[PDB]
Amino acid sequence: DNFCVQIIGGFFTWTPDGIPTLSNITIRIPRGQLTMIVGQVGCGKSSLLLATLGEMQKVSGAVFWNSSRGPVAYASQKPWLLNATVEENITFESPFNKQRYKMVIEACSLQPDIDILPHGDQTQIGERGINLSGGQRQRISVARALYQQTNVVFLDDPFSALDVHLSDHLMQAGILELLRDDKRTVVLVTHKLQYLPHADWIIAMKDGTIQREGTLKDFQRSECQLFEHWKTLMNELE
Amino acid sequence: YALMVSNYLNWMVRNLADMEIQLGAVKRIHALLKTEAESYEGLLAPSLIPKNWPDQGKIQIQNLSVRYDSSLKPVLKHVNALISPGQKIGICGRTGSGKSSFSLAFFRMVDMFEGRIIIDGIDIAKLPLHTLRSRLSIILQDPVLFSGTIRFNLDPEKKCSDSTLWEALEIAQLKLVVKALPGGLDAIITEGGENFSQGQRQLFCLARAFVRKTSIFIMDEATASIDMATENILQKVVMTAFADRTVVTIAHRVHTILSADLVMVLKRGAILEFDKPETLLSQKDSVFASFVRA
Amino acid sequence: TGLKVAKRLHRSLLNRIILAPMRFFETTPLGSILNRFSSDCNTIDQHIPS
Amino acid sequence: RACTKYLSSAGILLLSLLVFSQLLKHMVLVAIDYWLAKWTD
Numbered sequence: 356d357n358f359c360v361q362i363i364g365g366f367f368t369w370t371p372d373g374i375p376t377l378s379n380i381t382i383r384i385p386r387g388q389l390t391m392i393v394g395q396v397g398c399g400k401s402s403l404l405l406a407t408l409g410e411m412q413k414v415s416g417a418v419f420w421n422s423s424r425g426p427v428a429y430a431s432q433k434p435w436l437l438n439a440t441v442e443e444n445i446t447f448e449s450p451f452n453k454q455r456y457k458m459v460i461e462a463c464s465l466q467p468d469i470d471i472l473p474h475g476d477q478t479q480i481g482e483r484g485i486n487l488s489g490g491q492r493q494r495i496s497v498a499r500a501l502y503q504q505t506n507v508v509f510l511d512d513p514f515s516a517l518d519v520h521l522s523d524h525l526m527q528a529g530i531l532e533l534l535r536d537d538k539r540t541v542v543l544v545t546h547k548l549q550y551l552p553h554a555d556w557i558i559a560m561k562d563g564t565i566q567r568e569g570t571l572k573d574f575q576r577s578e579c580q581l582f583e584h585w586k587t588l589m590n591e592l593e
Numbered sequence: 594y595a596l597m598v599s600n601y602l603n604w605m606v607r608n609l610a611d612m613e614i615q616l617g618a619v620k621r622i623h624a625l626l627k628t629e630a631e632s633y634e635g636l637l638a639p640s641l642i643p644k645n646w647p648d649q650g651k652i653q654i655q656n657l658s659v660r661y662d663s664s665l666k667p668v669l670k671h672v673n674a675l676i677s678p679g680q681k682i683g684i685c686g687r688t689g690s691g692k693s694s695f696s697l698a699f700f701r702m703v704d705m706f707e708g709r710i711i712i713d714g715i716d717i718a719k720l721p722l723h724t725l726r727s728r729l730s731i732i733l734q735d736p737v738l739f740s741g742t743i744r745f746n747l748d749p750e751k752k753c754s755d756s757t758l759w760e761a762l763e764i765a766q767l768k769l770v771v772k773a774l775p776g777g778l779d780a781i782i783t784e785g786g787e788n789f790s791q792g793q794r795q796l797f798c799l800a801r802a803f804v805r806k807t808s809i810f811i812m813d814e815a816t817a818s819i820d821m822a823t824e825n826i827l828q829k830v831v832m833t834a835f836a837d838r839t840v841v842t843i844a845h846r847v848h849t850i851l852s853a854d855l856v857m858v859l860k861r862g863a864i865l866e867f868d869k870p871e872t873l874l875s876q877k878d879s880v881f882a883s884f885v886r887a
Numbered sequence: 888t889g890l891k892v893a894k895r896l897h898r899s900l901l902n903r904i905i906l907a908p909m910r911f912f913e914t915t916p917l918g919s920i921l922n923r924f925s926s927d928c929n930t931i932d933q934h935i936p937s
Numbered sequence: 938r939a940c941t942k943y944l945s946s947a948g949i950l951l952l953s954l955l956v957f958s959q960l961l962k963h964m965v966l967v968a969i970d971y972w973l974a975k976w977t978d
């Protein structure tokens with residue numbers, strides 16, 4: 356219907372016969388909107404992202420896709436780079452479409468990086484190629500995720516290796532402009548709470564379960580402690 | 594013997610071609626064998642080095658300019674600073690401003706073609722590399738974990754007791770996580786730490802540095818993969834636990850170094866501002882104020 | 888002869904690699920360094936003495 | 938050089954002993970076959 360992904364009572368385990376790393380997972384991700392998963396270290400965010408994708412073994416519950424999942428544009432927390440060039444990593448088995456490629460390059464601000472390296476936009480990347488900075492690896496992975504014409508985008512901490520300006524420009528030109536104009540489902544795991552005003556939907560996680568799931572106006576009344584805790588972290592969250 | 598010519602001429606030619614391929618393998622190993630090595634000898638005498646040559650943690654940096662190779666652009670240009678012992682130095686700047694090469698300069702991982710880094714009256718270029726890199730601790734932004742136990746990752750040489758390892762884990766907010774594991778300190782970390790999260794891997798590397806208990810800590814964007822709530826309590830417990838130790842903290846988030854003693858603002862490899870944050874935020878046109886406000 | 892060369896070449900390679908600078912490790916791919924321990928050392932230990 | 942690393946790692950004594958022992962063994966086998974040819978006549 357109006358949702359992209361939905362989980363009802365999902366118990367998922369990394370181990371085959373161990374303790375469930377996720378318990379009582381109940382999410383309703385809207386389609387064409389920005390959903391932000393927020394929480395502490397090791398609280399189930401990447402586990403939720405891979406439990407929707409089927410990469411983690413399910414013990415209980417149901418997973419519904421109303422997109423039969425289909426493709427999902429995924430940028431892992433550890434950036435994965437093929438042994439091909441910059442252009443082949445960003446395109447990633449897709450037609451070229453240079454007008455979109457320039458927009459993705461400017462949204463990730465990778466244009467100064469391809470004005471360096473011995474063969475800009477053609478240098479071999481990863482193993483058997485030139486070594487990149489970790490921020491450059493992160494932005495090439497995010498550029499691959501943003502470039503594709505996939506209805507669902509999964510981003511898992513894209514601002515970990517970047518400074519304030521790169522993360523702000525990638526948030527505005529890439530997430531709020533390039534992804535919104537396509538009416539694209541965006542699920543964005545982040546530790547940067549300053550982007551919470553730009554979120555349509557918020558999923559809060561705590562020790563491998565869904566603590567609270569709703570908008571910022573919902574968190575203003577349902578979870579007063581977590582709302583005020585967020586306000587203390589980033590110094591009325593409208 | 595003619596029948597042996599008919600049987601063995603082919604075998605001789607085949608073994609000659611095989612031996613050429615085997616000698617190609619030996620040739621590749623010898624080509625990797627002639628690679629240059631770092632100078633671990635050091636010009637200063639080992640008797641001139643004290644038992645704790647970072648006795649208090651004073652750092653002088655005099656006209657330092659570093660690069661990564663010959664005929665390459667210097668990533669730091671005329672860096673000159675003083676760090677009193679026990680002072681906390683927060684380093685901020687945009688990505689690409691040479692502030693990780695600044696951290697690598699103390700371990701001689703970059704080509705210091707000019708300038709000196711004098712620590713407690715001793716130039717570090719005169720020292721052996723194991724002597725220099727054994728008495729200083731660094732926390733890289735990207736975590737590196739090895740296969741084995743938690744005890745092996747924190748203490749591979751087995752030079753510290755279990756109480757030191759538990760203090761290192763408790764400072765790095767991993768007391769409850771490691772205690773929840775059934776092995777405890779013997780819980781197995783997989784290859785690359787794939788059984789833990791990115792934040793938990795980075796906290797394991799932080800606890801790995803907390804075992805060493807040196808006089809100079811260099812935290813090069815350590816808390817980048819960590820959420821803000823646990824980053825604040827980790828920063829507070831690091832400040833309280835290392836109150837007498839010189840900490841050079843490279844800030845992924847600028848608001849973490851608002852309580853630092855001095856703030857080094859790097860612009861394109863040059864120290865634009867090096868002063869207290871209280872005076873630095875008083876100036877409206879200062880770049881550090883633009884970092885805090887935006 | 889095979890045992891002596893197989894011991895000495897691996898000892899020399901392992902000692903010379905760990906002293907090489909990090910510029911060498913960043914410039915050279917890790918597959919090129921690792922295949923000397925994996926394939927070339929396997930030839931020297933086993934295939935060459937036969 | 939790089940192709941001669943195996944000979945230098947083996948040493949002069951071990952390599953020369955290998956070559957001399959193989960040559961002596963094969964010339965002994967030639968002598969056995971020649972003495973068998975003389976014996977059968």
Ligand SMILES: Nc1ncnc2c1ncn2[C@@H]1O[C@H](COP(=O)(O)OP(=O)(O)OP(=O)(O)O)[C@@H](O)[C@H]1O
Pocket residue numbers: 369370376395396397398399400401402403432787788789790791792793818819
């Ligand atoms: N591949 C894995 N195999 C086994 N256990 C895992 C794996 N990944 C995570 N875990 C465990 O499951 C829990 C959830 O980790 P998860 O991957 O969801 O972290 P995260 O919330 O994305 O972390 P962070 O925000 O610190 O990067 C943790 O306790 C972790 O140890």
Ligand SMILES: Nc1ncnc2c1ncn2[C@@H]1O[C@H](COP(=O)(O)OP(=O)(O)O)[C@@H](O)[C@H]1O
Pocket residue numbers: 488661668686687688689690691692693694695913
């Ligand atoms: N391993 C390396 N080899 C050569 N140059 C490097 C290396 N690492 C970084 N650089 C250079 O240093 C500059 C960035 O400095 P760095 O300390 O990485 O800044 P930051 O700390 O802001 O990431 C880049 O312009 C890059 O060219």
Ligand SMILES: [Mg+2]
Pocket residue numbers: 400401402432511512790791
């Ligand atoms: Mg994750």
Ligand SMILES: [Mg+2]
Pocket residue numbers: 692693814
């Ligand atoms: Mg850096």
